[PDB]
Write a protein that binds this ligand. Structure first.
Ligand SMILES: OC[C@H]1O[C@@H](O[C@@H]2[C@@H](O)[C@@H](O)O[C@H](CO)[C@H]2O)[C@H](O)[C@@H](O)[C@H]1O
Ligand SMILES: [Ca+2]
Length: 228
């Protein structure tokens, strides 16, 4: 598993144990700066090591399993520079309020395609969504705990305030293979939004519901490298 982003990512072949539905999620706090700061929001989220080590210094809010379905959301704040409560969609399996104006979220697991061929994932975010995809690039097959912090350059990323807060990733995938995926999200202030969808060459359907696509696999002693 090379770490570089590629159009032909490497996947994984789990053994006997049934993959579990959904991704894992970790939620962390992301404070504003002190009252009166200009701007009110902290730019820590754009430190190059924020998605790797920096987020870990912040308060851990939750770690949940089973995140699947439609993971898209749009949180409307009533004003900026203010921590405001909200809720993630039911898909996130987290039924507590959080400061939806200002938080960090990590999702990881595997993407299992239904078709063999080119997939184009489209992402957008307010404020930030960084995507790694493929063995090595995201993490190693059934060896996530050992490789989790060694993800490579992003396959796709979106940052609000850029020319477009939108990006795409086009990758050729094999049906029924399990591809490591890592989604890293932040809201710095005010509204928050995440959109993650895809299309394939097989038809003109847009997938927004990942119920049959996102899975979690236990790490194993020997890992589970792609056998196809
Ligand atoms: O529009 C979403 C965007 O809002 C940002 O807050 C903005 C701020 O950048 C500036 O334009 O002022 C307005 C109102 O005073 C405020 O909406 C926020 O920092 C971003 O993260 C986005 O949510
Ligand atoms: Ca925002």
């Amino acid at each position: 598993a090379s770490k570089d982003p590629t159009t032909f990512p490497l996947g994984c072949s789990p053994d006997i144990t049934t993959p579990k539905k959904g991704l894992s999620m970790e939620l962390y706090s992301y404070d504003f700066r002190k009252k009166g700061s200009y701007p009110c929001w902290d730019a820590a989220y754009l430190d190059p090591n924020y998605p790797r080590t920096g987020y870990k210094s912040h308060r851990l809010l939750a770690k949940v399993d089973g995140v699947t379905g439609n993971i898209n959301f749009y949180y409307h704040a009533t004003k900026g520079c203010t921590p405001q409560l909200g809720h993630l969609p039911a898909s996130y399996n987290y039924p507590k309020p959080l400061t939806m104006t200002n938080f960090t979220m990590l999702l990881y697991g595997y993407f299992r395609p239904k078709v063999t061929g080119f997939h184009t994932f489209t992402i957008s975010a307010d404020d930030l969504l960084f995507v790694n995809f493929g063995a090595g690039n995201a993490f190693d097959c059934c060896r996530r705990d050992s490789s989790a912090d060694h993800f490579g350059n992003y396959q796709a990323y979106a940052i609000w305030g850029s020319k477009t807060a939108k990006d795409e990733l086009t990758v050729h995938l094999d049906a029924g293979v399990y591809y490591p995926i890592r989604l890293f999200y932040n809201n710095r202030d005010n509204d928050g939004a995440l959109s993650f969808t895809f299309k394939t060459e097989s038809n003109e359907n847009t997938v927004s519901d990942f119920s049959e696509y996102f899975f979690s696999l236990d790490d194993t002693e020997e890992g589970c490298p792609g056998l196809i």
